[PDB]
Design a binder for this molecule. Sequence first.
Ligand code: WSW
Length: 763
Amino acid sequence: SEIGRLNNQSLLWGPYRPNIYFGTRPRIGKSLMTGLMWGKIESYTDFQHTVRYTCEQNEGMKGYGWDEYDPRRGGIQSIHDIQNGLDITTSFVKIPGGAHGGSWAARIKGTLNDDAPKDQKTIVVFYVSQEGENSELEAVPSENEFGYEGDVILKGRSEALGNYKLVVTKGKGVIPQSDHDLSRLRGPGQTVVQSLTYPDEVLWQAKPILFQQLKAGIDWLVENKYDVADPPPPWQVYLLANKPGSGNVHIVQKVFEGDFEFDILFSSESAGKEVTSKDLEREVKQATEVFGERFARVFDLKAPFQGDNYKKFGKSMFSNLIGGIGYFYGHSLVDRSYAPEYDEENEGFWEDAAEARARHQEALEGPYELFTSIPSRPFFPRGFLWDEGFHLLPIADWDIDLALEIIKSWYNLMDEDGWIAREQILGAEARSKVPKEFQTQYPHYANPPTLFLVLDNFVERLRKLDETLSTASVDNPEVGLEYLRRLYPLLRRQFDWFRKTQAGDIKSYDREAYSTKEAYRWRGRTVSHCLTSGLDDYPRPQPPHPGELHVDLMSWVGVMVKSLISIGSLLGATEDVEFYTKVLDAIEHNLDDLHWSEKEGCYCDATIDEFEEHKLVCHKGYISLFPFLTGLLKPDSPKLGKLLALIGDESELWSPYGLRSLSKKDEFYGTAENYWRSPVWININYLAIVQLYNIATQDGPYKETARDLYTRLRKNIVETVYRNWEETGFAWEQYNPETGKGQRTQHFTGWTSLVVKIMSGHH
Ligand SMILES: CS(=O)(=O)c1cc(NCc2cccc(CN3C[C@H](O)[C@@H](O)[C@H](O)[C@H]3CO)c2)cc(-c2cccnn2)c1
């Protein structure tokens, strides 16, 4: 209980809004949130097009991301904006104290790049909102008549936060001054504040809210005879009239000419000592020192990646991944019809499922919360169930207690049946990024249970102030065991849920196998996809068929059952462990009986013929490797040897840049959207690397073969990701096996960051 409380206090605040360039919120659904906007203004109409707020990636943005980050301490983010001619640094640091999750500060620094006009005007906005019934927030009025010559002080209070103050400092930089007549009524140019109220549920809509106020300011000009015969300067037309007061929205606006900086200082009243800019600077220097030391210990990069260039690469890949952590809160859109068409029992089921979807029975439910890392700030800034299992592998190395906290957050979503939606779109803010047709979640749709892999690592570590907190759950075995005790029933529920909802059919068909129970089919396939498997367009049996069996899914059930054996054992769940043991024995056999192709020398998904007979459908690629990737095969298995042959075969899967998702020899190589039909994906490559390492470091007939393949694939993968990062500044979603180029989405950190752990080695 005590470690839980300390963890809660430690993690409460952060820049937990990775969907935007920079903002903060605590891990509380309805509370205080901040966000930064900026944009150059060169004309009367450009600012609407230049202003930055939500993360994107296009020609106008060179790059951005965290140079260092630890959610307990803070970090530094750098932003390279071509359109606005600005290199920005946002430094964020947390200062523990008091009873309400402590205090924090940020420094915003903007430096014009070499190309920008030296006298560029940049508008900067700090937007502050607070949601909640019995909470207050008020901007202390200025002494000056038109705005603020110095700091802006917000004083607020809530049940969650107690009393606090939020200061936006005067800052450094030239403030442009207008000699226009308007300055008699609006002042010559100064910091301004507007305090406003809207219904709580729309406060997230900062850009429209800001622009509504800018437009009202412009309508006032038109009405008051400021016109094109003698127009005020653009930056003055777009400077809000000062009107501070009480409200649930506060817009703090500054205009700078040239380079600029200012601070944001959040002081929790219960902590006593109010935060200063000198504290900010001290705490930032200290967090950097601590980050450096921890990285060198946790991610000790091995040959041939010991050099400084690979260290900087690793720090960037890691910091972007952990820096992607967000807190999300709100309702989710779910189809709770459980329409019988979703059972997918007939041939042509995808048409029936489409029919049921077309009834649009889905509705909002919750509210829910989630604390999670994300695949991608600009494109996918929300929780994805199987991606998180990969995200947490490096995060757990860094801070096991944080990883366990995220696992716990995810499992807190699980419904009475054992279902967790594979994509977590929580609240209107999260929905704004997602086309409506893709928001609805389906209680029959699974996703790989990769979060079990993180639990496996934790279990292994358990068997063998911010410093203390990060490892408390391993350093105190009783703490770790109690965590497992509480989570175990939900893990079991999910296991049971997979067997209930994703069962395949042995008995209806001419199908002979060691066990009549162990067989699995992903629900939710369409003619060209199986999105729930995670390998969206990997070739599957055609047509889809209720008699399909998917070897990757059976393999995942294998993973779960092994974790449940280890955790059950730890908890003395004697009866459960007997049941799991029988299940694992059955899967080990059924993998062979239902999915092994002797002819092809690999595993295959299966289907049922036009003649109602079992048929293997082999498409050599990631799926073919699954029992190996998931660690299910014995080290001396002859099947494992044939799988190693395939892995190392340059004419099949082995490219100079990593393992191809699909064989060059497959009929579907490079076809259609070509998403999982050739490109190199880091998450699956990582699993291969780990399993090769396992074989390489044990006595057996394939030790040497595995050692060679491990060494080479490690090097190929790291170097591909490194070269692209050096050249483009990005982690990419996947890599071209012909050219080695990064392709598909950028800022994929994201499981591409698994590269840091591959470099550290020593699995
Ligand atoms: C030209 S495209 O056909 O290459 C292509 C395909 C897709 N698919 C839809 C889709 C939705 C959510 C997330 C992901 C990413 N990813 C897919 C992985 O396959 C999963 O395993 C993994 O969990 C999941 C999470 O990281 C993809 C999307 C885009 C896109 C969509 C919206 C905005 N921008 N771009 C482009």
